[PDB]
Structure formats: C-alpha cells, structure tokens
Design an enzyme around this catalytic site. Structure first.
Site, PDB file in Angstrom:
ATOM      1  N   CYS A   1      51.822 -49.859  23.341  1.00 41.69           N
ATOM      2  CA  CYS A   1      51.487 -50.475  22.066  1.00 41.69           C
ATOM      3  C   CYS A   1      50.067 -50.147  21.606  1.00 41.69           C
ATOM      4  O   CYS A   1      49.096 -50.417  22.314  1.00 41.69           O
ATOM      5  CB  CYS A   1      51.666 -51.992  22.160  1.00 41.69           C
ATOM      6  SG  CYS A   1      51.237 -52.878  20.650  1.00 41.69           S
TER       7      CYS A   1
ATOM      8  N   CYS B   1      47.805 -53.283  21.125  1.00 41.82           N
ATOM      9  CA  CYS B   1      47.502 -53.826  22.455  1.00 41.82           C
ATOM     10  C   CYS B   1      46.336 -53.060  23.068  1.00 41.82           C
ATOM     11  O   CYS B   1      45.445 -53.649  23.679  1.00 41.82           O
ATOM     12  CB  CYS B   1      48.722 -53.729  23.385  1.00 41.82           C
ATOM     13  SG  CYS B   1      50.021 -54.950  23.075  1.00 41.82           S
TER      14      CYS B   1
END
Ligand SMILES: Nc1ncnc2c1ncn2[C@H]1CC[C@@H](COP(=O)(O)OP(=O)(O)OP(=O)(O)O)O1
Ligand SMILES: [Mg+2]
Ligand SMILES: [Mg+2]
Ligand SMILES: [Mg+2]
Lengths: 669, 105
Positions: free
Chosen positions: B30, B33
């Site tokens: 991600c 993230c």
DNA sequence: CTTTGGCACTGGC
DNA sequence: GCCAGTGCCAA
C-alpha cells in the site's frame, strides 16, 4: 408442393391455440392466409396436398408445426390430424445438411452473438422472427402507455403476427429454392418444386432422405422424454451440499482470508517525484474531511480494500495459496496464468502436511461442485429441466456436428457422468424406464440399451481394406478389440484403452499419449510405434487422405457414406473426419432402420404403445419398453438393423451391437 | 519504539493495555501505508509517555482487522481501555496526526 | 497438434 | 448481463 408456417400461443409443450397460418402453393403461385377461425380450412388444405401425393415444406416443422398441428387439431376441433412423414420437407433440416459447416441459433434458443463463424442469412432471419416480433410488440405498447408483461405478444392473435407469418413463408420459400439449387444434392434436370413426394426422395441424394427420417424420429424421442427420478436427485443434492460445506469449513480453516485492493479510482503517484506508479493499487483521495468524528481527511490518501474468503472454486485463489506454501508452477497458459487442473494438482508438493492434504480436499471439492452444477444448481441442471410428466425432454440437433454427428442440449443428455465415475451410479440410475409407470397397468417400464461395438475402429478396418485386404477387419473380430488392446498396452481399464487407441488413431503426440495412460512421453513413443507398426496400413490410409485433399486445398470435403459433402477443418484431423462421419452416418441410418423394423413387426412407438426412444448418444440408444419380452425384441432388432446397414453400404468390416436390459441407464450401459 | 502486534498478542497488548494506544493496520503493497510509516516512527518517541504506537500488518495477521470493519488502509485506531475512542483512515501528514492525537488525548 | 460437442464457475468491464 | 479464460463431462 406447398410451403407453410403457423403461429400459435406457446411452445409445443403447452400450446393450446392456433392463431394463424399461411400457405404458398406452387401450382397456383399464390399465398393464402388463414386466421383464427380458418383453422379447419387450414388443415384441409394440408391434407388435400397429401391426397395428391404432394409435399409440404416447413422450416422446423418436423419438431414444431407438424406435432403442434396434431395437438391443436385434437384440442380445438377434436379432429385427428397426422401428416405423413413422407409428405413433409423441413428447410431447417435441409440447411443443416447443406451448410453443415455453419452454426445456427437453434431457432433463437442460442444467442447469435455467441456463436462462432458466419450464419446463413435466410435461416438467421427465420430464427430471429419471434424476437423481432416481440420487439415490435413492446415498442407499440410503450407508444400507447401500456406496460409489457412476460411474453404477452403470443397470448392473442393480431395482424402484426399475421404479417410475420406471411414473411416466414416468403423467406422459407427463398431458403428452399436456394437449397434446391445445390446440384450436389439435387440433380439439375429435375424441378424439385414440381414433382410428387416419392420422386423427391428417390431422385435426390440419399442424404436428403436420411436426415428427414432422422429428424422425424428424433422429434418423437424429444416428445417421449427420458423418465427421471427427481426424488433421488434431490437427495443426492442434499448429500453433496453437506459434503461441500464441510470441505469449505475445513479449507477456510486451513487457508485463511485476506484483503486485496478494490475500488481504487485514482492513480498513486510518488510524493517526492510525482511519477505515476500504475503498479501500486489505485487509491482514493477524499475531497472533504478534517480534524469532526468523520474518518477521512481531505487530501489524506488511502487504498480502498475488500476482505476476501478462500474460494475452492477459484483457480486463482488456489494458485495463490499453493505458491505461498512453496509451490513452483511448471506449466503456464497463453495468458501467464499457471495451469491448475486435476493433473497438475495431483502433482503438487509442499512442506506443510496440512496444506498438502488440503490439496485432496480441493480436488474433491471441485468434483463435488461439478456434480452439483450439472444435477441441481447450474442454469442447465437436471432438476431445473424435469417436466410435469416426470421426464427430462432433452433437445437434439440431428446434424449439429460437422462430421454428421448430432449435438445434444437443454440439458445435454450425451454428457451424463459415467457409472464408474464418482456419484455416477446415482446420476445414471436417475435416468431410467423404471421411473415411468405404465398408463394402464401402473407397472414400471423396462429399459433396453444397445451400443455399436468398436464402431470407429471398424470404420478404420473398412477404409483400410484396400490397403491390407481385410486383415484388420478380420483380426478385429477376434475377441473384444478394446480389451485386447488394453492387455497389449498394459492399461488399467477397458475405458483407458478406448481413450488411448482413439487418441493414438487421431494424432495424439507422444506426451499426450503418455498423459492418457498416466505415464511419460517416452512411454508414449513406445505405444505409438508399437500399434502403428502392428498396422502400417494406417499410415497408407492417412497418406492417401492427404494426397486427395491437400496439394492449399485440392478439395476441402470428404464424400460421406450417403454421398453428402463432409467439410474437413484440418489436414491433421482429416482421418477423424472420415471415420467419425462414417460412424455417425452408420448410426443414424441404424436408429432409423431399427424403429422401422420394430414397427414392421407391429410394435407401436409411444408411451401409450410398446416402446419409446428415450435417448440417442452417438452410437448408443436407450429405449423404454412396456415389457421384458419387448425389450428382448428391441435388442435383437437393433442387431439386425446394424447388419442391414453394413450390407446396405457394402461395408468392408462386419458391424455389431451389444445390448443390455435393465431398469435404468446405470445398468443398461 | 514501536509495538509490532500479532493476531495472538492483540488482546493483551491493545485491549488490556489500559492507556492510550494508536494502532496502524497496514500492508506492504500500500502506497499510503508506506507514506505515514516514517511519520509514525517520529510520533512514537515524541509522545513517548502519553501514548503507545502499535502496528499490525494485515497480511501476516488476517484475523484482527475484520473484527473492526477495515475498509481501507492505512487505518488508524486509537484505543482507550480496550475500546476504540477515535479512528482515521489515510496517510495524514505529521501535522494532522499531532492534531488528532493532542485533540484525542 | 486426438477429434466432435455442452456447460459451469471466476473475474473483469 | 456479456464475454474471455479454463477446465471437466461425454462419445
Ligand atoms: N476419446 C475419444 N476420442 C475420440 N473419439 C472417441 C473417443 N471416445 C470415443 N470416441 C468415438 C469413437 C468411438 C465412438 C463411440 O464411443 P464408444 O465409447 O462407444 O466406443 P466403441 O464403440 O469403440 O466402444 P465399445 O465397443 O466399448 O462400445 O466415439
Ligand atoms: Mg415457425
Ligand atoms: Mg460403442
Ligand atoms: Mg457408446
């Protein structure tokens, strides 16, 4: 000769009203319309043509119009109407013979945009008529403010329907003439629109007669239907569903769920650089949001995800979990995806013992689903097709395959699991004469199953005779040929031997042969030269076929046993074309001759008679019989008909059949 | 300085830690993230005393996130006495995070 | 280079 | 709901 068509309120199964009909008469050259109250007159016109020794042309009349007219004549006028088979012509049957290399929508039952290749124009028009009519109807309704229901367009007669009826005959006539202009099937010196019925059949290629006879008989079979044990299948379904659940529980326990990106609408770009990273999952950057108990913050990007549970029916999920356990694929497809079939799964090896065993659970699951799909949940499932009369009325395209074989669908009764496959006993047993109780005595009927012996290998014998003087034709009769091959090839079962010999005969490579017998390519070589050297005339036949067809094509069709043109798709599949077609034509004339002989003995075809065809699976017929004595005669008669067919076409190899008597398909095959 | 959770250590490390705990549900694949990650390393020692920063990789620990209805990542859950007191989804700048924390502490 | 067929189930638009 | 990709069921 006349051309006709009718419009009625529903499919044959529930039709109750004659809306209209149209008749074009070649002798007067005029079209005459018959509205609702002209039904009696319509029938008289058809019988009059019969009285002259004439002919009536319908497009798909063999399966619909003719039997529908018999039914509607009884219901509406309480009249006995039965057009003789010899007086009817069917343009659909004819086009399927002439243009056997093309597909068709089976009268709109199939989505045209899904079929491969081109479609004959006139026939396309005809098969789409109902859908076009339905559209005109809905359109006109919306223009007047009324709402459209199911298929109300067929509930009542109307002039739009009448115009389409007239259009059917015009198109059908054009199709007919187009078909009759094919010099190969219809001699140029004869005007086939100006001769009696006996002349039509006797002066045209033998194939024209055979296809019309096969269509008449097969239409009857469809009407008979195949007695089905609905209760047994509903119970099989419960049993399979529970096993599926338990396998799912065990699998979702071993292979846990996970999250993956889903819903990304925006592209993720590197903060520093700003370059697009199309590989990273797509994200979403909330417009509104701030620090407000809302969870999002304007400008603060995140990756939308979804939670996914392990699905054993997903080759993708499977591939994902097995590699995550140390599996390294050895074979991929022309799309990058790794092969995940039973053959590959059977060969997978991983460290984790639990995950290893899970592979067997997965194979079992896929198989269980295969049975649930075919028997109960699929769109074409048996439980979805059983009729009020307790029978499944599978459809049959008498000449649906290029080789002259028939095709089967809705559901496909030629693909019922074999008794030797998992759950095959139960599946097979649900299809049986025993499930039909006599309309008078209430007693169960008996089943007679007959299957041509080593059919296509005997066809090989026939065509190899000019090369080997009948040696193979003779040696093939020394005991069972497949069992004899099984022994020589050291195979586990007779079925394995059959799929081996045919794969071999039809060009299977060394690797493929190995797979079939469950071994390696080297073992495939051994077998290939072993059987090839034991019968070198096979190469001779192949070479001869090649020299005749290939030069670029010297000619792209083989002449079938009955004279038709049989389209060849590939030089490498040519031998298969020759043998499968021969075998298909033999079996077709065979089922025809069989019934004809039963009737000549006085037996009556129908549930209210003595016997009834329930299914025809290429070189196999399953027949319902009112009594065991009748079943014995059906079996004996089927054998006589086969010897008759072999003699009829001066076949160079003796032909045989094996018959079985029992209560169902599990025992009769 | 950061607490790396597992599915099996979640209950005692978060739900019973009785105090302020910021949990970050993330995955290596991600982008966002990967963005807020550096921010979390700094918040950690800066709030060392009034807050605890814990991270849980949802791929290695698939059983915890579902119980919280995760729908996107990174998901930031600030627990208090074993209960969620506030949540935020997405890669917030250090500034916004400090706000969220000061405002919720 | 097995061939002829029907059909289900996942996953992308 | 349409369609490509796979793979299994039969002869
Ligand atoms: N695997 C196959 N590949 C190609 N054609 C096949 C295959 N299996 C069967 N056929 C063709 C050739 C034989 C024909 C009828 O099948 P069937 O199983 O009845 O064989 P058969 O007639 O040789 O055997 P039997 O004597 O046991 O009935 O269908
Ligand atoms: Mg019609
Ligand atoms: Mg056979
Ligand atoms: Mg057979």
């Amino acid at each position: 000769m006349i051309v006709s068509d009718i419009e009625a309120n529903a499919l044959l199964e529930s039709v109750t009203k004659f809306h209209c009909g149209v008749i074009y008469d070649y002798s007067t050259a005029e079209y005459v319309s018959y509205r609702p109250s002209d039904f009696g007159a319509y029938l008289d016109a058809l019988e009059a043509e019969v009285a002259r020794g004439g002919l009536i042309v319908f497009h798909n009349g063999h399966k619909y119009d003719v039997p529908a007219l018999t039914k509607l004549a009884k219901l509406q006028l309480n009249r006995e109407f039965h057009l003789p088979r010899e007086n009817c012509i069917d343009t659909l049957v004819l086009s399927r013979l002439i243009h056997s290399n093309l597909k068709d929508t089976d009268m709109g039952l199939l989505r045209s945009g899904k079929l491969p290749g081109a479609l004959e124009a006139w026939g396309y028009r005809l098969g789409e008529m109902k859908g076009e009519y339905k559209d005109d109807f809905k359109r006109m309704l919306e223009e007047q403010g009324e709402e459209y229901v199911d298929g109300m367009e067929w509930w009542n007669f109307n002039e739009e329907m009448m115009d389409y009826n007239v259009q059917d005959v015009v198109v059908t006539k054009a199709l007919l003439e187009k078909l009759l202009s094919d010099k190969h099937y219809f001699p140029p010196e004869i005007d086939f629109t100006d001769v009696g019925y006996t002349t039509f059949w006797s002066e045209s290629l033998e194939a024209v007669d055979i296809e019309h006879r096969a269509a008449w008989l097969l239409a009857k079979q469809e009407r008979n239907g195949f007695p089905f044990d609905t209760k047994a299948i509903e119970e099989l379904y419960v049993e399979l569903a529970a096993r599926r659940s338990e396998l799912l529980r065990k699998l979702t326990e071993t292979f846990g769920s996970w999250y993956q990106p889903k819903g990304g609408t925006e592209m993720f770009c590197h903060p520093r650089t700003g370059k697009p990273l199309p590989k990273y999952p797509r994200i979403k950057t909330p417009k509104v949001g701030g620090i407000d108990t809302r969870e999002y913050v304007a400008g603060a990007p995140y990756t939308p995800v979804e939670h996914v549970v392990f699905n054993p029916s997903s080759r993708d999920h499977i591939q994902k979990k097995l590699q995550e356990a140390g599996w390294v694929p050895t074979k991929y497809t022309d799309k990058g995806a790794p092969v995940v079939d039973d053959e590959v799964l059977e060969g997978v090896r991983v460290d984790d013992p639990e995950k290893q065993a899970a592979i067997d659970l997965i194979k079992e699951y896929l198989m269980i689903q295969k049975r649930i799909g075919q028997s109960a949940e699929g769109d074409k499932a048996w439980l979805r097709y059983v009729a009020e009369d307790g029978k499944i009325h599978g459809s049959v395209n008498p000449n649906g395959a290029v080789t002259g074989r028939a095709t089967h669908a809705f559901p496909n009764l030629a693909q019922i699991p074999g008794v030797r496959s998992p759950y095959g006993e139960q599946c097979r047993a649900a299809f049986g004469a025993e499930h039909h109780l006599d309309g008078i005595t209430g007693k169960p009927w008996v089943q007679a199953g007959i299957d041509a012996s080593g059919l296509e290998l005997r066809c090989l014998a026939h065509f190899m005779a000019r090369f080997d003087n009948g040696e193979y034709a003779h040696e093939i009769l020394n005991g069972d040929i497949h069992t004899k091959n099984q022994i020589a090839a050291e195979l586990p079962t007779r079925d394995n031997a059959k799929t081996f010999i045919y794969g071999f005969l039809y060009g299977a490579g060394d690797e493929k042969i190995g797979q079939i017998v469950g071994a390696g390519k080297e073992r495939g070589k051994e077998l290939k030269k072993k059987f090839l050297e034991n019968t070198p005339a096979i190469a001779a036949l192949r070479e001869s076929i090649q020299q005749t067809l290939v030069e670029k094509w010297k000619r792209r069709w083989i002449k079938g046993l009955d004279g038709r043109k049989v389209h060849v798709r590939s030089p490498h599949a040519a031998l298969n074309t020759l043998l499968q077609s021969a075998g298909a034509l033999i079996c077709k004339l065979w089922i025809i001759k069989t019934e004809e002989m039963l009737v000549e003995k006085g037996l009556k075809h129908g549930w209210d008679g003595d016997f009834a065809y329930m299914a025809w699976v290429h070189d196999e017929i399953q027949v319902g019989c009112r009594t065991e004595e009748i079943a014995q005669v059906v079996i004996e008669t089927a054998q006589e008909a086969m010897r008759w067919v072999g003699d009829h076409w001066n076949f160079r190899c003796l032909l045989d059949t094996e018959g079985k008597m029992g209560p169902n398909w599990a025992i009769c095959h | 300085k950061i607490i790396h959770l597992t599915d099996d250590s979640f209950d005692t490390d978060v739900l019973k830690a009785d105090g302020a705990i910021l949990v970050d549900f993330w995955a290596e694949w991600c982008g966002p993230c990967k963005m807020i990650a550096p921010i979390l390393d700094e918040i950690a020692d800066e709030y060392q005393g009034k807050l605890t920063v814990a991270k849980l990789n949802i791929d290695q620990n698939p059983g915890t996130a579902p119980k919280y209805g995760i729908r996107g990542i990174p998901t930031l859950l600030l627990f208090k006495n074993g209960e969620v007191a506030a949540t935020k989804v997405g890669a917030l700048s250090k500034g916004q995070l400090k706000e969220f924390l000061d405002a919720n502490l």
